[PDB]
Write a protein that binds this ligand. Structure first.
Ligand SMILES: CC(C)Cc1sc(N)nc1C(=O)O
Ligand SMILES: [Zn+2]
Ligand SMILES: [Zn+2]
Length: 231
């Protein structure tokens, strides 16, 4: 059963097997007086592991590495952060210290710096324009355009038809907007439609926060976003 927010004390990290060689990682952290769960991805990359997003903070990200070592036992050699917020780059300094090469797009690295957040070391080329996709080991990185943030990326695992939507995709049970200070509400539905067109074969869809679903989460997120804008 996929772990829920109340089952994960702040500071602990769970791994969840999605498919052969594909895991989500789930952690918890406080934001504006409440604790929320947060997802990222782990993908086998030959004899190495590719990490998608930190576990939202240095302490959680340290627990993430320890849980990977305990449960999987292959080295995390690269990490991609899918936008500049703390649930994605919070913990980059820990990863770097542990020997992980950290990556993000130029926009993400720039926005992280502006915001005073941790900054991934290496720039990802080829993601500057809505609709751009690049291969990165066992995954494809896709920039769908502005949504939850102007820089948000999504990640697809072809070997397993896993789409990691990050914070641009909402879980089914989430019905209000939330952390949209940095969003482009008007562009968010268009960006989601690019995701639908590019990954129509996605079997598992992982939101940035909450329970995994299918492509139904895409239409679901667009409804929520609109409702926020309507009023
Ligand atoms: C209601 C919460 C999940 C809002 C939060 S907290 C956090 N770190 N991210 C978000 C988001 O909207 O992506
Ligand atoms: Zn965010
Ligand atoms: Zn988030």
């Amino acid at each position: 059963e996929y772990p829920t927010v109340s089952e994960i004390p702040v500071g602990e990290v769970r791994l969840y097997q999605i498919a052969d060689g594909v895991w989500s990682h789930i952690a918890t952290q406080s934001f504006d007086g409440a604790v929320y769960p947060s997802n990222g991805l782990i993908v086998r990359d030959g004899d190495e592991l590719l990490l998608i997003d930190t576990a939202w903070g240095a302490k959680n990200t340290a627990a993430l590495l320890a849980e990977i070592e305990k449960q999987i036992g292959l080295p995390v050699t690269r990490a991609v952060s899918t936008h500049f917020h703390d649930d994605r780059v919070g913990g980059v300094d820990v990863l770097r210290a542990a020997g992980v090469a950290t990556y993000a797009s130029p926009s993400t690295r720039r926005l992280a710096e502006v915001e005073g957040n941790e900054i991934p070391t290496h720039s990802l080329e080829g993601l500057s324009s809505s609709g751009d996709a690049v291969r990165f080991g066992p995954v494809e990185l896709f920039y769908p355009g502005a949504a939850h943030s102007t820089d948000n990326l999504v990640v697809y695992v072809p070997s397993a038809s896993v789409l990691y939507g990050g914070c641009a995709i909402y879980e089914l049970s989430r019905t209000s907007a939330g952390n949209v200070a940095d969003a482009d509400l008007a562009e968010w539905p268009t960006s989601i439609e690019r995701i639908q067109q590019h990954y129509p074969e996605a079997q598992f869809v992982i939101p940035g926060h909450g329970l995994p679903g299918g492509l139904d989460l895409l239409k679901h997120t667009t409804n929520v976003v609109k409702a926020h804008t309507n009023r």
